């Protein structure tokens, strides 16, 4: 907290540079948002199978979106991109990452393929893997709770994670903005409270600037039991995340 503000400022700069290209899927000949949703959901599952950090998941998704921003990929190779990305995210973030063997096993492909794709992903991303995530902004926002609330936190993570699944609309929003929306939405759902004044001072964001993201996130939250992908909902039933996916979304936000 000698550095909380320095770090936030720096992350705010880096998230703009680390941002995926918003319209990349129209340029992909053979893959769709729906195929990406499927892949991301599967990564959520891998995350749970191996008890990986939520941060590792958020990073892996950032690597995939930046990779696919410049590299055309056929549908049969999309899971190889996701595997290498999750392997890279784990090495960067985890104290004990799974071995290459474990990633080979969890996929279809060979160890040789996974490793070559790893080297390919690093080349394309030019080794720039310390990217800001919704998760990194949420944990800083969590500091502004009075008092701290575990349900608020888990629900904010749950909402921020659901945003990872759907490229349309969420590719267009910055991580700090998704985190803002997720935090307000959770706070409101749980306690009836709103985006605090101290976070306006910190971020420059108000309920007005967060509104478009919030409207999107609120709709995603309401329609969540009906989404084709369900791994996040199942994951967040666990006591580890205070069963927050069992909570009822509010019917309106009144913003």
């Amino acid at each position: 907290p000698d550095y909380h503000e320095d770090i936030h400022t720096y992350l705010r700069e880096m998230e703009v540079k680390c941002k995926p290209k918003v319209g990349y899927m129209k340029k992909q000949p053979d893959i769709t948002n729906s195929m990406r949703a499927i892949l991301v959901d599967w990564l959520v599952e891998v995350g749970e199978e191996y008890k990986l950090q939520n941060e590792t998941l958020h990073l892996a998704v950032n690597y995939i979106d930046r990779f696919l921003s410049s590299m055309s990929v056929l549908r049969g190779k999309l899971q190889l991109v996701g595997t290498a990305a999750m392997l890279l995210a784990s090495k960067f973030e985890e104290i004990y990452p799974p071995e290459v063997a474990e990633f080979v096993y969890i996929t279809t492909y060979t160890k040789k393929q996974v490793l070559r794709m790893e080297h390919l992903v690093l080349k394309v991303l030019t080794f720039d893997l310390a990217a800001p995530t919704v998760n990194q902004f949420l944990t800083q926002y969590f500091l502004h709770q009075q008092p701290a609330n575990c349900k608020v936190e888990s629900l904010a993570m749950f909402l921020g994670e659901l945003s990872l699944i759907d490229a349309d609309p969420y590719l267009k929003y910055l991580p700090s903005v998704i985190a803002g929306a997720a935090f307000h939405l959770a706070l409101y759902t749980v306690t009836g409270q709103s985006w605090p004044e101290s976070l306006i001072r910190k971020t420059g964001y108000t309920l007005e600037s967060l509104k478009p993201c919030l409207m999107d996130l609120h709709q995603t939250y309401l329609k969540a039991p009906q989404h084709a992908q369900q791994s996040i909902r199942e994951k967040y039933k666990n006591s580890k995340y205070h069963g927050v996916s069992l909570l009822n979304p509010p019917e309106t936000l009144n913003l």
């Binding site: 907290p1 000698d2 550095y3 909380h4 320095d6 770090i7 936030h8 720096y10 992350l11 880096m14 950090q53 941060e55 392997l87 890279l88 090495k91 960067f92 104290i95 990452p97 071995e99 290459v100 160890k111 040789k112 996974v114 490793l115 070559r116 790893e118 080297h119 690093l122 080349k123 080794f127 720039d128 893997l129 310390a130 998760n135 990194q136 944990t139 800083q140 500091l143």
Partner: protein, 298 residues
Amino acid sequence: SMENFQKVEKIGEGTYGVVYKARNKLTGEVVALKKIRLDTETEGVPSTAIREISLLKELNHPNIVKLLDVIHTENKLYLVFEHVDQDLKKFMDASALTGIPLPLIKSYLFQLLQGLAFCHSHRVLHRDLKPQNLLINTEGAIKLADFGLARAFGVPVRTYTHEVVTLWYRAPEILLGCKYYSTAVDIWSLGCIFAEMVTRRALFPGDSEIDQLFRIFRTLGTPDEVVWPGVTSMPDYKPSFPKWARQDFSKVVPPLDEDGRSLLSQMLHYDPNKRISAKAALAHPFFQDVTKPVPHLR
């Protein structure tokens, strides 16, 4: 790829890979080449390389070793760095009978605190500060090197790798098994090095964790709930620990004067929350008359 470099000699092996001095044949630039062997059929690119490269590309600072290029084959990785002239350890050994001038000690600590405040500001922990990883050039600069153990952290921190920092420089909260450590672990190491620049021997040369803890307690006193709230709850704290009285700091590093002792004592505070940050330390009165002389040897 490596065609434009002529290897001169081996410098050493740090956390991972091998470092060589080489020269760019086209520009004349003398470089340090970190050679990393890969393979396939094994683990791929090491997490240490992934971290070091991605973090060093962000950390451009006069007091941080500069990463120039990454030359990436299917078999070998080569990090190209600016070459620096000598490490602090070799320089302290060379200063055997002259001592290191106080202006130079003060310049080096100031510069080290600058490089470290820049790291911490960019959410990087170094986690291996020791004289061998600190490099000095002919113009009076000192730089943090070997970012092989570094990592990006969050606010607030979560649990990171426990087996971290070379023992002599390792902070008491690591030694006592605390699940959260943070920026204060790098400041501790720097406090150990400040003392070492002055006396030219390690402040706490332990050969094991308990030995290391006990050397720390005998110098600074055994921490209790007054000096470090929470200490007695720490995982590897033991009520059986001998309770040593705290030494007067004028005896810890006798040549240091009032301002120097004050700064050292804030760097070596038990409680990581109370330990001074690198940022706050730059404005310590110790530094009021700081200059940047060239080293006095070579």
